Design a protein around this ligand. Structure first.
Ligand SMILES: COc1ccc(S(=O)(=O)N(CCCc2ccccc2)C[C@@H](O)[C@H](Cc2ccccc2)NC(=O)c2cccc(O)c2)cc1
Lengths: 99, 99
């Protein structure tokens, strides 16, 4: 689709059979989800945003369907304030910015 | 332009006698610029991101040129690590997400 920006670019994602709302975020290098359980090994990681650094759990090779487009990649889980789809998965679904 | 997301979508903006590199950021409601002493009235504000909140100065009706496209709107100035062009200006220059 083409998504305009007068509203937040929130979309439905499917991850582990669960439907969630997530923000398509070109300013995010990584995909960061609110705390949830995901299967498999994770490793502790730290990431930084506008207000400082947080601790997250890094899960690799996780399938995420974003508005019906399939990605398989790294998902960080932690105290992000909102679910964020970052460039690591936006590139997999062929997302670009256009003006 | 079409801008892919393999790297951070950094572009040149101009605000007065300062050309600046800024992130085209669909996950940002507002435009947040690194510390700069803009003229005119402003209002204090707190904005929240990953890691918590920062204190910023809200300046209104500031002209900002982004890759040659003219915009005018609210600019938040504060201790952000990166200049962020948010949706308030992205819409004005006709920016969409496409996949
Ligand atoms: C109201 O206006 C704004 C509010 C917030 C922001 S933002 O910069 O924090 N923010 C709002 C996000 C939604 C959100 C909303 C509410 C809480 C938490 C997240 C904009 C993000 O795109 C942000 C931009 C960025 C990049 C580098 C350094 C610093 C910031 N990226 C990130 O936080 C980020 C995420 C993952 C990995 C990474 O390396 C960076 C910008 C504008």
């Amino acid at each position: 689709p083409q998504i305009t920006l007068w509203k937040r670019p929130l979309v439905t994602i499917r991850i582990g059979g669960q439907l969630k709302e997530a923000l398509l975020d070109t300013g995010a290098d990584d995909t960061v989800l609110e705390e949830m359980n995901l299967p498999g090994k994770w490793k502790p990681k730290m990431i930084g945003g506008i207000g400082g650094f947080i601790k997250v759990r890094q899960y690799d090779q996780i399938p995420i369907e974003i508005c019906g487009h399939k990605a398989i990649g790294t998902v960080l889980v932690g105290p992000t304030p909102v679910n964020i789809i970052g460039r690591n998965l936006l590139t997999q679904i062929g997302c670009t910015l256009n003006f």
